[PDB]
Amino acid sequence: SNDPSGYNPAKNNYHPVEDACWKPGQKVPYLAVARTFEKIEEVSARLRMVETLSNLLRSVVALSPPDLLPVLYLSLNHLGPPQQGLELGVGDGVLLKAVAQATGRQLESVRAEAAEKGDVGLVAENSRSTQRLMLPPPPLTASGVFSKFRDIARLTGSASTAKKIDIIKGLFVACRHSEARFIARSLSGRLRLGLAEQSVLAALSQAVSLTPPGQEFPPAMVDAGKGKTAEARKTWLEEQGMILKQTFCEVPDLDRIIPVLLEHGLERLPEHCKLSPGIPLKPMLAHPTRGISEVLKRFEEAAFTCEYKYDGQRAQIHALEGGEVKIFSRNQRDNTGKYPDIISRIPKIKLPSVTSFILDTEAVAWDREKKQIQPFQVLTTRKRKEVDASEIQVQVCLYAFDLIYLNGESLVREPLSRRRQLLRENFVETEGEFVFATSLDTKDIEQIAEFLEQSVKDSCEGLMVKTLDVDATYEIAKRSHNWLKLKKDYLDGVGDTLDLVVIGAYLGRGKRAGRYGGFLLASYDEDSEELQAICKLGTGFSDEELEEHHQSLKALVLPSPRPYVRIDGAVIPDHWLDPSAVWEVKCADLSLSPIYPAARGLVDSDKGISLRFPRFIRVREDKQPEQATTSAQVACLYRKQS
DNA sequence: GCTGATGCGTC
DNA sequence: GTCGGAC
DNA sequence: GTCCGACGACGCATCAGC
Ligand SMILES: *P(=O)(O)OC[C@H]1O[C@@H](n2cnc3c(N)ncnc32)[C@H](O)[C@@H]1O
């Protein structure tokens, strides 16, 4: 209809035709998407966000079906299917430079304003573009903006950054109302709607259920739920939602799903898009569990297995009928070129009767000389793409723990008891190359506890716990976190805690805007009587605790750092703090840092020590900096990881 | 042709 | 990756 | 329990700057 600026997709009794802000066949205006983001961000109830997005999507289906795919990608802040590897190459650095040039302001003024407001979108929105003529360019369209994002991502090579900035400046010149806010957030990778993949899928299945695609215009059926009771409508939308969710979890690729959805409908979708080797799928995840008693409470009387939780990276290995092999990451990225050693070993791990499979494994760095597992840090030094087999320096051992597909059979609906038996019988172990995850089938608390201790002694993070027959399938759509993860450092009073000094604070972004979002911490070097930065910290405190931190550190702000505080290459804090507050901090491991100075020279000549997965536990009101954990104590903790 | 800063992915 | 907030 | 977005260390790949 008329004037996107007034578009209200949160409206009660939203009518997909009469309440749209564009006419049939027209391109969806980007302002329509921006206004939808505004109405989503204004509320906290996830179900209300879904309804609002569904309203937009229903208008897109009814009026401009070719724009459904770009509108969906804009709402997820994706560029396309993950296995295609498109990357903007734009962070806050490029973005802030483009905003400075677009608005004619100094880069430093823009950087300072972004940090104080905690959002680059607000800076871009509230400053005019000095490249704008008297008469604006035509309004942005959803598909136009999406295509420009893709243009940015495809620019490569020398002088490519300047070309990316030119595209961004062009977008800002054409923005109206709130559009610049969401372009900027999207480019920075921080859309921060409160609505993401699961809510987008729920909105999509609701939208195509209520307003079916493919109708002759004007659509005879704009609300297919209106003839049902509230109860019947809810059950129906839940069923339709699960059809979409389960297909997506097997084929998480909107380029494949959306054309089928528009042509054949949601009910026929599983017939056209099915799990198959060569198409990455969503992996099964794990829920953190803070004790053995919590495990037994979660699984009740269902038999379960405990497995070592190996410290590497996930590798989803696909063997296609015909011999081709592909390897994908946890997030559906193509890692095939990264593992020529693994690909060459596939004939060695599968019996000759296996014609196709999808394996779920952990790739762990392996020292062939000493025949033992190596830390994650070592694994991350492998090259990432177009790697040749002879050039591999860090060997990998695969620890296999699941089987999702075998000889043409999808196993997603099969219980782990059967998947595991098929894994054990059709694949071959080779020490230090391909091994089944160490496992224990028991319900005895004393055995589980001992097994947890042994997993740590054997260079693992803890245990994974999985039911064998009750709710034991690989249906991510039913429950994405169907497994449990049990780590020692989850236990209170157990694991490595340090008492560290707060030496700086960083202004918060997003949910943390208007206060501190992070802090710089330091250990005390006895030998030089200096405080050495050891890590940053940004999780572990409640919202109330964070407000107390803000009020207790405000009096410690210094304009300039103390000469006995050393941070070297760490990110300079927005506010320096007089060393006084001491906090108890927990971590999973200690790592060798190329940047932090803490304990430098005590374990390595060039590298200090930092914390893996640090989190705030509590303030140490009874400690001053002189009694904080020493750099020598940090080195001793690092060494005993062996 | 090299180095550092930036981006993005891994955990 | 950990964590807490909102539902 | 689910979903989400605050925030963590770290390393390769890339490209601006030299
Ligand atoms: P996150 O800490 O949420 O844990 C899940 C990941 O752990 C890895 N992993 C290692 N060993 C296993 C076993 N035995 N089973 C399942 N997952 C395991 C995977 O890479 C998961 O992504």
Question: Using a 6 Å cutoff on CB, does residue A309 contact ligand 1?
Answer: yes
Q: Is the CB of A287 under 6 A from ligand 1?
A: no
Cβ pair A499, A628 in contact under 8 A? yes
Q: Which nucleotide is nearest to A329 (CA to C1')?
A: B10
- Mutation test residue for ligand 1: of A285, A362, A484, A490, the one with most atoms within 8 Å of CB: A362
- Which atom of ligand 1 lies closest to the CA of A466? 15
> Which of A290, A314, A380 most suits a substitution to test ligand 1, by most atoms within 8 Å of the C-beta?
A314
Contacts of A82 (CB under 8 A, 6+ apart): A252, A280, A331, A332, A333
- State phi, psi for A336 to the nearest 5 degrees: -55, -45
Give the span between the Cα atoms of A576 and A32, in whole angstroms: 43
Could you tell me the distance in Å between the CA of residue A153 and the C1' of nucleotide B7?
12
Sign (positive or negative) of CA dihedral A502, A504, A508, A513:
positive
Query: Looking at ligand 1, which residue's alpha carbon is closest to its atom 7?
Result: A309
Name the experiment that determined this structure: X-ray
Nearest atom within ligand 1 for CA of residue A439 = 14
Nearest CA to ligand 1 atom 4: A286
CA atoms within 13 Å, Cβ hemisphere of A441: 8
Taking 3-state DSSP, the helix, strand and coil percentages for chain A, each rounded to the nearest 5, stand at 40, 20, 40
What residues contact residue A339 under an 8 Å CB cut-off, 6+ apart?
A: A315, A327, A363, A387, A396
The answer to whether residues A583 and A515 touch, using CB atoms and an 8 Å cutoff, is no
CB closer than 7 A to strand B: which residues? A 87-95, 189, 311-314, 329-331, 333, 376, 380
Q: Give the residues across from A313 on adjacent strands.
A: A363
Ligand 1 centroid to Cα of residue A1, in Å, is: 51
Q: Give yes or no for a contact between A590 and A556, defined as CB atoms under 8 angstroms apart.
A: no
For ligand 1, say whether the CB of A612 is within 6 Å of any of its atoms. no
Q: DSSP letter at A218?
A: S
Query: Is the distance from the beta carbon of residue A56 to the nearest atom of ligand 1 less than 6 Å?
Result: no
Q: Could you give the CA distance from residue A579 to residue A500 in angstroms, rounded to a whole number?
A: 10
Q: Which domains does chain A have, with CATH numbers?
A: 1-285 (1.10.3260.10), 286-311+438-495 (3.30.1490.70), 312-437 (3.30.470.30), 496-642 (2.40.50.140)
Which helix (H) or strand (E) segment is A516 a member of? strand A516-525
Measured distance CA(A434)–CA(A397) in Å, rounded? 6
| Positions of chain C reached by protein Cβ under 7 A | 1-7
Cα A263 to Cα A26, A81, A258, A353, A594, distances in angstroms: 20, 20, 9, 39, 53
Query: Up-side HSE of residue A70: CA atoms within 13 Å toward CB?
Result: 21
Residue A307, ligand 1, Cβ within 6 A:
yes
Q: Could you identify the residue whose CA is nearest to the C1' atom of nucleotide D13?
A: A384
Distance from Cα A309 to the centre of ligand 1, integer Å: 6
Round to whole Å and give the CA distance between A538 and A35: 31
Q: Cite the active site residues of A.
A: 309
CB A88 within 8 Å of CB A149:
yes
Whole-number Cα distances in Å, A27 to A74, A141, A399, A421: 15, 6, 50, 53
Alpha-helical segments (H) within A367-470? 376-379, 416-426, 445-457
Q: Which atom of ligand 1 is nearest to the CA of A485?
A: 4
- Does residue A440 have its Cβ closer than 6 Å to ligand 1? no
Beta strand A462-467 with A575-577 is unpaired
The full length of chain A comes to 642
The protein residue whose alpha carbon is closest to atom 22 in ligand 1 is A314
| Structure-token pair, residue A635 | 């080195």
Q: Mutate which of A287, A309, A451 to test ligand 1's pocket (most atoms within 8 Å of Cβ)?
A: A309
CA-based nearest residue to A105, from A133, A134, A130, A136: A130
CA A363 – CA A327 distance, rounded (Å): 11
Q: Which nucleotides of D are covered by protein (CB under 7 A)?
A: 1-16
Assign A397 to helix, strand or coil. Answer: strand
d(CA A208, CA A68): 11
Q: Which nucleotide is at minimal CA–C1' distance from A43?
A: C6
Q: What does the block give as tokens for A622? A: 């009874």
Amino acid at A626: E
Alpha helices in A525-624 (DSSP H): 543-553
Q: Could you tell me whether strands A496-507 and A575-577 are parallel, antiparallel, or unpaired per DSSP bridges?
A: antiparallel
A336 Cα: distance to centroid of ligand 1 (angstroms):
20
Distance A438 CA to ligand 1 centre (A): 13
